[PDB]
Design a protein around this ligand. Structure first.
Ligand SMILES: O=C(O)[C@@H](CO)OP(=O)(O)O
Ligand SMILES: [Mn+2]
Ligand SMILES: [Mn+2]
Length: 509
């Protein structure tokens, strides 16, 4: 029957010479190793300008899957917004100004919330500073900040430095007050764990949660309990009289300064949806909010977008569809948005002929508790589909290296990589058995460095290059490639014409 071409993404799996804290290098990977030694291979740049990001900026699943599916260097939001600030266009943004005019004309308050760090994956604290400076320029009197603590795109216990700098900027600009602090685990969930979302929501709307007069004492107290940045319980900063600094009320305006959509949709829907059934927001939840999303999150969000989206035409999924091929997207919960929405160029709707399989990730708080996650279930489901001779193209993502690597724990991440290697062998061998070809690669690093040189947890991504193995004998792969060269390579193998929009180039010499 069909000789499928499968694009296999080992999420957060990069190549790094240094072996200290390197779960990728330390893991026993007999399958990956044999494919690497027996088939044509190379490495690709997955960071910085090569993927549409600022120089030196590490990649991530959004950036990576967008570039992989697009077959071209995809200009990223971080870069775009940084340039708007650099060129003096940020302050002229009609949406930001409308939000500020709203609060001034109706005598309400402006709330700013988002990830509080310079990680650059979901936000950048300098964008928050630009918004504070703009609010001051426009004469907005009441501005409240609801900080979402990081520890995932930066050090696990770095919140104090960001809070301190924010406090300095607030004093310098003469506007702003920190109202709440919440770990991104609660305020930025993407797994439909509504109990987590509700906690963040109630801290911001009802002033419910651990209370502190001093933001730094809130963090220190959490640390004393072994609860670091990412997991800080939604907390409420209170005034001298004990009342919350600020709760979100009717007719207020909100600017969510996150520019990556996957972790912003849930809390945004909670605030803007007329009909919300995931949980009872309470008869007195805020209504008539002027809600601003820094970038496009979802059509379901009743708000305004500051930096409008632009369609990515002729991405891999569209080309496959146009040529009448059947394609399958598959991954477990954690990377399902990436093999679907992001891979499709920032499009939720499936292309004609595109099927999707979602495998539920395990019900554990952190994945170091179950390194194998649901990889075996993903593999079992895919093997059945391959056996059925249904798909011409397959896009599979194994979330493990990345998801467990974010724990900053060496042994668990090694187990995650080894589990994925076992699954990789079954999938690739099955594909080869069908006369097909596999393109084994990754979207960015993570598991390659889960410990800092001093032995402490390294919970974020790395800037190391990703591997690429094409399981086809008799060919050679050129070096110096980028993520945007993968789609052209896949089309090359499928014998399909490459669209003009794909400025990337096939890796096959
Ligand atoms: O978990 C996330 O949202 C990011 C880190 O902020 O990681 P990844 O890009 O792998 O999804
Ligand atoms: Mn990833
Ligand atoms: Mn990651």
């Amino acid at each position: 029957s069909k000789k499928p071409v499968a694009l296999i993404i080992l999420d957060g799996f990069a190549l790094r010479d240094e072996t200290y804290g390197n779960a990728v290098a330390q893991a026993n990977k007999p399958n990956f190793d044999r494919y690497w030694n027996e088939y044509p291979h190379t490495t690709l740049k997955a960071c910085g300008e090569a993927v549409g990001l600022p120089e030196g900026q590490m990649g991530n699943s959004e950036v990576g899957h967008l570039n992989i599916g697009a077959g071209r260097i995809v200009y990223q939001s971080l870069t775009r917004i940084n340039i708007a600030i650099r060129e003096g266009e940020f302050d002229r943004n009609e949406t930001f100004l409308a939000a500020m005019n709203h609060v001034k004309q109706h005598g309400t308050s402006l709330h700013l919330f988002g990830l509080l760090s310079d990680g650059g994956v979901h936000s950048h604290i300098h964008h928050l500073y630009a918004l504070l400076r703009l609010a001051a320029k426009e004469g907005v009197k009441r501005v409240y900040i609801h900080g979402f603590l990081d520890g995932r795109d930066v050090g696990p216990q770095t919140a104090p430095q960001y809070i301190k700098e924010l406090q300095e900027k607030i004093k310098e600009y003469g506007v702003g007050e920190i109202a709440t602090l919440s770990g991104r685990y609660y305020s930025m969930d993407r797994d439909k764990r509504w109990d987590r979302v509700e906690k963040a929501y109630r801290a911001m709307v009802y002033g419910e949660g651990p209370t502190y007069r001093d933001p730094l004492e809130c963090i220190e107290d959490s640390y004393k309990h072994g609860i670091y940045d990412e997991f800080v319980l939604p907390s409420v900063i209170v005034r001298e009289d004990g009342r919350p600094v600020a709760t979100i009320q009717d007719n207020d305006a909100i600017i969510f300064y996150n520019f990556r959509p996957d972790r912003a949709i849930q809390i945004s829907n909670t605030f803007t949806n007329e009909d919300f059934r995931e949980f009872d927001r309470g008869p007195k939840h805020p209504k008539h909010l002027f809600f601003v999303c820094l970038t496009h999150f979802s059509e379901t969000v009743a708000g305004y977008v500051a930096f409008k989206p632009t369609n990515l035409d002729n991405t891999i999924g569209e080309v496959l569809s146009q040529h009448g091929l059947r394609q399958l997207r598959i991954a477990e919960t954690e990377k399902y948005p990436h093999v679907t929405f992001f891979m499709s160029g920032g499009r939720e709707e499936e292309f004609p002929g595109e099927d999707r399989i979602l495998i539920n990730s395990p019900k554990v708080p952190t994945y170091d508790l179950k390194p194998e996650m649901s990889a075996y279930e993903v593999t079992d489901a895919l093997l059945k589909e391959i056996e059925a001779d249904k798909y011409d193209a397959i896009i599979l993502n194994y979330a493990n290296p990345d998801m467990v690597g974010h724990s900053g724990k060496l042994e668990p991440t090694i187990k995650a990589v080894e589990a994925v290697d076992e699954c990789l062998g079954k999938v690739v061998d099955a594909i080869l058995a069908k006369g097909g070809i596999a393109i084994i690669t990754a979207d960015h690093g993570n598991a390659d460095e889960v410990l800092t040189p001093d032995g402490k947890p390294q919970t974020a991504h790395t800037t190391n290059p990703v591997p690429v193995i094409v399981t086809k004998k008799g060919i050679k792969l050129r070096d110096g490639g980028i993520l945007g060269d993968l789609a052209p390579t896949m089309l090359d193998l499928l014998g399909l014409p490459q669209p003009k929009e794909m400025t990337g180039k096939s890796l096959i010499v």
